[model samples]
Target: GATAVSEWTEYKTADGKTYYYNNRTLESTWEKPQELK
Candidate 1:
């Protein structure tokens, strides 16, 4: 099934760097990446 998976989901790049982007427009929430916080 095709679902709309966006920034809310955790994104791990091919280099093993994990990133996340909380969507404020859709979920009304926010979070800073582990390093960015």
Candidate 2:
């Protein structure tokens, strides 16, 4: 069977704030298209 999988995406801000994107928040504005880090 084909099931859906989840992943984590890391984002680092210029102010030194690092955030990890979970499945729920991955599709929100918090997720940047490009890596600023």
Candidate 3:
């Protein structure tokens, strides 16, 4: 199965901070996705 970070996407928050969000996984995080790094 694909990992959470693999399925997630990067976006900008209101404060111009980076955020990760995954629709299929229904996950969100303020920190950068580990796999993406």
For each candidate in turn, give its C-alpha RMSD to the true structure in angstroms. 10.2, 8.7, 3.2
Minimal lDDT window, size 10, model 2: 28-37
Candidate 1: C-alpha RMSD after superposition: 10.2
Segments in model 3 whose C-alpha atoms lie over 4 Å from true places: 1-5
Clashes within 3 Å, all models in order:
0, 0, 0
* Candidate 1 clash pair list: none
Q: Rank candidates, lDDT, best first.
A: 3, 2, 1
Best by TM-score: 3
Worst 10 residues of 1 by lDDT: 28-37
Model 1 alpha-carbon miss at residue 34, Å: 9.6
- Runs in model 1 deviating more than 4 A are 1-7, 25-37
**How many clashes would you count in candidate 2?**
0
Estimate the overall C-alpha local distance difference test score of candidate 2: 0.54
lDDT of model 3 at position 20: 78
TM-score of 1: 0.31
Q: After superposition, how far is residue 8 of candidate 2 from its true place, in Å?
A: 0.2
Using lDDT as the measure, which candidate wins? 3
Q: How do the residues 1-37 of candidate 2 rate in per-residue lDDT, one tens digit apiece?
A: 5544445566787978766675545552355433333
lDDT of 1 by residue, 1-37 (tens): 5544455646677978665655534442234433332
